[PDB]
């Protein structure tokens, strides 16, 4: 029991039997108000596979593993579901032939896996592994032979390896070696053609049960959330597992490897790298996007886990848990946006008020609810969660001040050094984009509604990030979107922006069922900037047609004309704003609403209170707009068109 | 009298838009074989335009005479694999109508015309000539709006606001054409203009509605149905958006896919950095980055490579492949050999025309000729294209084993920027080689296309910088696209080829074992590490002295006759872990089908996919009727079908794949 625990902490792991304990006490931390915490927070039943090859739920003794893999299937306490929610707990047993994969271990990750699939409830993975087994025929070994192409001489090579008669004979039947039998020199011999060995798990075998657990990964993304942890490190098959599972945790001081430093020095000659931290630390995972959140110690790693949960609806076939407000919806919004850059993570989170304290400047979600993921890549498009009344959504919020980008020195070529980039406010950039994408599908297979805090002059049409595949990612986020089955609220605050191209891939039409936009007062749209517009639209020509129709003076000339130039060209630029409202928005029919900052938190709040209680019924429309008609009457029909009432309405009728 | 748009087109560098159906027409006669024996109405096509209800109707009507930037037309061409006819959809922009921009109706007959073709579940074909979004401002205001100034001595001082006069706020109806707040200012009243509208349909937003509207049906398109697009002369925002929704492109040279022009990066940037839009989006950089799978040099070689891309895809997403009898014959054997050194994997797979003699050709795995592969410029360790074995068209993915020399174009934005040479070791799957490999599996797969994978890969890039560019999320793409695969999937290890570790993991059978065949070469290797990481790990210095104690006569002073002996009782650890990667050991694991021969490999895998094909069409008429049935239903139904008409002393021929196949091309 402690050399086991002895054996984890020096690799400064946490031991597979010890992790339920971990999470019995973070429950503990995440319960809100002692003394009332709950009866038996914490239940669970450990997965052990039968020699049928069949999960079992049977509980025995910690240490008693014959497989290095431990999964247990628990029910959590927790403020969002108090009588418990369930999830599948996986966890690579790194004592146990130092973490690696064998059948045995493919094998209850794939039924553990394939257990929380049939469910529909959370798989989180914990991390702590050397990839696939290695393996040689070690009887094989100390009895082969070898035939010389010279036998004085081990220079010249070899001709083939070969088995005496007698242990060729004596190996059976076995099945572990291939023999080709040889009348050579005057003696009889068995040139080894092919060697199988009598184990399991030796090569090629392992990789079948690599493929097995990846293609289940891969579908689990799709039908239920997965979480993975890192811890001490993932190589080859498991850190393709925690990247097909997308939602990564790394703990500091680890690893996200798929071949090692000596094992790539080896091959490339020299001593290129250092450290396996080097290659996939938090340094290249945290920032390339690989890895969603770091973390000091495997503890905080077990409260990140039940925090993001904790945003999550039961399983694959429940809503998403909201809860009682603390922070009230009817607030105004105390932050205020600037025509100039500011951090948007104020507008999402508020912030402590800048001159008086210990006050707090508020914002749009509840108070303390903003935890944001992928944090150092991509800067220009903030990604998180957050709640709305309650209710947990998923966020996406543009990044309008210039942002840098650290490209870190190629530690194989010598002369290579850190290529420092800034990036500008308000653009998808290649990496931005596929941010923007990654968050959407994330967020889709959580069964989370999405919302979008709009502020885009475009997509970077540059020579290098043409090159770099903006257009590639820009077309995967009107696909994300396409494919979105919750709630998506698009809104432009204001002095935001959407401009050309931008909101070309995220328009109503794309997905009307569940896209929505709501565009601030003081909000833009327009396919160019007033300028862009001015130059095409508003000449010089124009310009002077302007001034010999305004100007009395105009009426020698171009004296006139050449110190108004600049003048008239203000007026033009003012002129073509006028056509970027969010009241020819509404003219047009493009947004559903226009929203005032300050009370956007309420409408909001109701509008998406009312979406998600209309869905959750359908789980047809015109059915549901005669029910209100029936039950309230054909005098009140005209409530439909407000949010609280029939919120009220429905939270009530049922 | 049109003939001025014809010219307008002429010196655009692209083809007026009633001019490609005659070009579509000549590209049928120019492939089809021997005259003369030219089907009657090789084309026959109707237009299609828009009613004043917004709905899409089939005219017959003579060129020139649209309302709208936009043409649209219904195809019915006679080709080698249709000979009786197959239906496309032909969208394309009208560079001559307001240079091609997208306005209101530009964007509903895109729209309607693509509905049409996935109602259908047909070829959707979009030619790319535009200008994107369409802009514009109110003209009537523009001439009548006066300007309060802040001190209008003096000028400038700035703007108050923009307002009308009580005479133009009247004249202006009744219109709608803008919004304003009635202000007394000094004494006289003003009519504040607080937002303008305009008269006239598509000016701002309305038109990335507009826009909006189309990418989001072209993204459901190439989900559904075959989409093919071109670029001629230029594409632009939405325009360069919906070629690369449709994924597969055709870029002209000399034509540009952008989405800001040089001049408006230049203003926006406040340096003249860009001379030219080919420095954006030219074939220097669509052609070299996989967003433009082709070039071609004028748009008659263009349109030649639609109906070429064509003859590989089936006449609607319900048809069967297009299987054409075969004039290179599937008795024969491969005459090209692979080498234990690096070749161009080209000549397994297209053959080459003959070394020493010339020649003809000296044979590879497929038809003669019917390579044609896509995306030649990008990410060159992987290549990928379409090809017909014994006349069935397929997918083809091989592993590049040259190492490959990557030319970084010059950023003329940054200072100290060259055009930087990157070595790309060749099987090996790099960031950009395996998002290659995962965009081939998922287009091929959406054009109902059976995979064939030359499997030649020592794993995944594993240095920092590597990492650093994301080879975990696209070798993961690989695993999505191929679990998600819905026709046969034929990977094969040619001889000499090896498949280690990371890169058995992505593309095993169990990822999609309804789909997946895999298939070793008797000279091809697989295991976890290669036999110096085995040798490395497992078989170490301890063991190593073991053997020399035990197989050395002398060593029985020791430790001066073991170290002249390490460094080849280590080649004999090397022989011994290489013996565990062979053929046999993968059989015999159950992890391959067959130890395959490359003389016969041709042959064996045609019969074979000749079969899965078969089977796959038997299967889909069964769970019609019987959706609970599975797969082994359908197997021992056709095995005992089989038992018990030719034998039961022909049972063991089931196992026989000709035999399988001539039994039910028969029955
Ligand atoms: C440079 C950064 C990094 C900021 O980002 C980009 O590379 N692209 C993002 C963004 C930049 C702004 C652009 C919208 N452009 C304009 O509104 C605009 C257009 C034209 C212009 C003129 C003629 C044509 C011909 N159709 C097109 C544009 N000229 C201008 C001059 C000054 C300021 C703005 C503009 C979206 C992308
Ligand atoms: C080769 C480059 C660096 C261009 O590509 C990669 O980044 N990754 C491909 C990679 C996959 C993993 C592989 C390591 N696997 C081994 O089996 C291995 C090979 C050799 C090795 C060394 C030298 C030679 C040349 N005689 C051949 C193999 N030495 C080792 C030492 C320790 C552990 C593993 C290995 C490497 C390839």
Redesign the pocket.
């Known amino acids: 029991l402690q050399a086991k625990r002895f054996q984890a902490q020096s690799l400064g792991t946490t031991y597979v039997y010890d992790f339920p304990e971990m999470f019995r006490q973070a429950l503990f931390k995440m319960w809100p108000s002692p003394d009332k915490y709950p009866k038996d927070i914490l239940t669970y039943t450990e997965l052990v596979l039968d020699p049928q090859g069949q999960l079992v739920e049977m509980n025995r003794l910690p240490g008693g593993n014959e497989v290095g893999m431990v999964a247990f299937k628990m029910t959590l306490k927790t403020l969002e579901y108090p009588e418990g929610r369930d999830i599948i707990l996986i966890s690579n047993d790194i004592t146990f032939r130092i973490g690696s994969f064998g059948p045995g271990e493919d094998l209850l990750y794939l039924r553990a896996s394939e257990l929380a699939r049939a469910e529909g409830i959370p798989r989180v993975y914990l991390a702590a592994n050397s990839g696939a087994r290695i393996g040689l025929a070690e009887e094989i070994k100390h009895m082969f032979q070898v035939a010389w192409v010279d036998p004085e001489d081990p220079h010249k090579g070899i001709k083939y390896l070969y088995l005496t008669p007698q242990d060729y004979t004596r190996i059976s039947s076995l099945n572990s070696v291939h023999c080709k039998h040889v009348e050579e020199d005057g003696e009889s011999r068995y040139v080894i053609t092919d060697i199988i060995g009598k184990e399991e798990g030796l090569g090629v075998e392992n990789l079948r049960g690599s493929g097995m657990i990846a293609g289940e990964t891969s579908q689990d993304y799709d039908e239920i959330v997965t979480i993975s942890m890192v811890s001490c490190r993932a190589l080859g098959i498991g850190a393709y597992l925690v990247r097909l599972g997308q939602r990564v945790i790394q703990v500091e001081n680890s690893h996200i490897i ?3 430093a ?3 020095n ?3 000659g020299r001593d290129v790298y250092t450290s396996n931290n080097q290659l996939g630390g938090v340094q290249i995972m945290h920032h390339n996007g690989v890895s969603h959140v770091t973390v000091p110690d495997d503890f905080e790693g077990v409260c990140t886990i039940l925090e993001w949960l904790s945003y999550m609806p039961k399983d694959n076939r429940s809503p998403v848990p909201v809860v009682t407000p603390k922070d009230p919806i009817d607030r105004e919004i105390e932050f205020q946006p600037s025509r100039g850059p500011y951090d948007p993570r104020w507008l999402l989170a508020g912030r402590p008020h800048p001159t008086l304290k210990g006050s707090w400047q508020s914002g749009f979600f509840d108070q303390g609810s903003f935890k944001e993921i992928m944090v150092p890549w991509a800067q220009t498009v903030v990604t998180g969660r957050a709640r709305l009344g309650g209710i947990p959504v998923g966020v996406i919020a543009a990044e309008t001040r210039t942002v840098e980008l650290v490209v870190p020195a190629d530690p194989a070529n010598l002369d290579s050094e850190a290529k420092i980039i800034q990036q500008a406010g308000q653009v998808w950039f290649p990496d931005s984009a596929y941010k923007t994408a990654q968050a959407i599908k994330d967020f889709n297979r959580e069964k989370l509604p999405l919302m979008i805090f709009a502020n885009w002059r475009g997509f970077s049409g540059g020579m290098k990030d043409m090159y770099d595949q903006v257009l590639k990612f820009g077309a995967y986020i009107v696909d994300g979107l396409r494919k979105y089955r919750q709630p998506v609220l698009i809104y432009i605050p204001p002095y935001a922006e959407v401009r050309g191209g931008s909101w070309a891939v995220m328009d109503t039409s794309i997905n009307p069922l569940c896209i929505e936009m709501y565009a601030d007062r003081e909000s833009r749209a327009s396919v160019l900037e007033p300028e862009g517009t001015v130059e095409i639209k508003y000449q010089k020509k124009d310009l002077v047609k302007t001034i010999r129709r305004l100007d009395p003076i105009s009426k020698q000339l171009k004296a006139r004309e050449d110190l108004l130039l600049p003048m008239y060209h203000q007026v033009a630029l003012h002129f073509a704003d006028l056509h970027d409202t969010a009241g020819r928005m509404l003219e047009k029919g493009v947004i559903y609403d226009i929203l005032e900052w300050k009370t956007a938190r309420s409408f909001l709040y109701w509008r998406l209170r009312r979406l998600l209680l209309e869905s959750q019924v359908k789980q047809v429309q015109s059915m549901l707009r005669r029910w209100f008609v029936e039950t309230e009457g054909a005098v009140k029909a005209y409530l439909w068109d407000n949010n609280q009432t029939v919120v009220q309405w429905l939270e009530a009728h049922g």
């Open positions: 798929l071949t090692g000596t094992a790539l080896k091959v490339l």
